[PDB]
Amino acid sequence: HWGYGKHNGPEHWHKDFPIAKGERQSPVDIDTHTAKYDPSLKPLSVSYDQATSLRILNNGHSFQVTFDDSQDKAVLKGGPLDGTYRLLQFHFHWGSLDGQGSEHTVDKKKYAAELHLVHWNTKYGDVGKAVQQPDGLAVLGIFLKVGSAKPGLQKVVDVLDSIKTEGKSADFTNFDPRGLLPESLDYWTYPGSLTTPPLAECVTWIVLKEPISVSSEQVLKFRKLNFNGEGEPEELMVDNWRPAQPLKNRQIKASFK
Ligand SMILES: [Zn+2]
Numbered sequence: 001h002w003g004y005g006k007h008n009g010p011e012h013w014h015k016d017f018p019i020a021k022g023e024r025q026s027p028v029d030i031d032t033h034t035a036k037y038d039p040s041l042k043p044l045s046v047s048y049d050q051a052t053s054l055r056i057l058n059n060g061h062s063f064q065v066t067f068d069d070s071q072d073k074a075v076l077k078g079g080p081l082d083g084t085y086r087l088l089q090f091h092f093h094w095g096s097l098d099g100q101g102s103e104h105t106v107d108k109k110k111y112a113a114e115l116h117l118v119h120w121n122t123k124y125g126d127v128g129k130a131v132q133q134p135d136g137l138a139v140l141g142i143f144l145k146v147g148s149a150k151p152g153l154q155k156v157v158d159v160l161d162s163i164k165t166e167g168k169s170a171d172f173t174n175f176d177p178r179g180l181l182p183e184s185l186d187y188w189t190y191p192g193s194l195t196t197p198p199l200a201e202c203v204t205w206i207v208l209k210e211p212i213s214v215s216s217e218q219v220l221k222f223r224k225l226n227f228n229g230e231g232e233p234e235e236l237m238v239d240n241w242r243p244a245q246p247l248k249n250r251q252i253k254a255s256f257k
Contacts (some may be wrong), residue, residue, distance in 0.1 A: 001016075041189070046076045056169060061196060061227075081138055114141055131198075137203045150212050
């Protein structure tokens with residue numbers, strides 16, 4: 001069973017998931033000087049006004065907030081995407097200390113955390129089918145730096161004590177993910193993969209340039225979560241990030257000059 005430790009972490013994943021060594025793996029370092037501005041890229045359309053959050057869950061690798069994706073309520077369109085992508089869930093990756101935690105890096109800089117909003121292409125009908133397609137998923141990635149608090153994150157922070165260990169969930173209705181977005185929707189994009197098993201090469205990555213700021217107290221609460229189930233030896237859920245993978249034959253494109 002895979003994880004982030006010495007004996008089951010990212011450098012082991014290829015044994016159960018050989019696509020780990022594939023041609024379009026994520027995350028990557030974003031070399032800002034090499035990314036080409038693409039004037040044909042559209043602004044991203046984030047339509048989250050009718051989002052319906054359902055539950056918050058500790059899945060043993062991260063925590064996730066899940067949405068009703070049975071209709072087009074919270075959708076991502078435009079940008080590099082063709083078609084409509086439904087929001088299924090968001091989750092985070094973070095570090096043991098503020099100098100690591102993000103999956104993507106920017107000129108090798110690591111952020112304290114990274115938010116992933118996972119969306120699937122409605123033309124494939126369900127997420128299981130979408131992960132089998134090269135354009136099945138769109139993941140919007142947002143960097144977190146530590147400074148001022150993010151008010152729209154606090155409702156999430158405050159319930160994490162109720163989902164400390166793997167398998168715990170709670171109701172998490174009426175959460176508005178618009179409160180997690182930075183001012184600018186300027187972005188980089190590239191074709192990649194899921195960053196956790198099964199590492200499927202089904203993702204159009206959209207990584208926002210502008211980080212959000214969160215407070216030290218907010219990120220400290222992430223670090224109190226446990227990878228373990230209740231009753232097992234306590235192992236803090238920290239450093240749940242995959243390192244940058246080889247870019248290979250890919251171009252990262254920027255929406256902005
Ligand atoms: Zn992720």
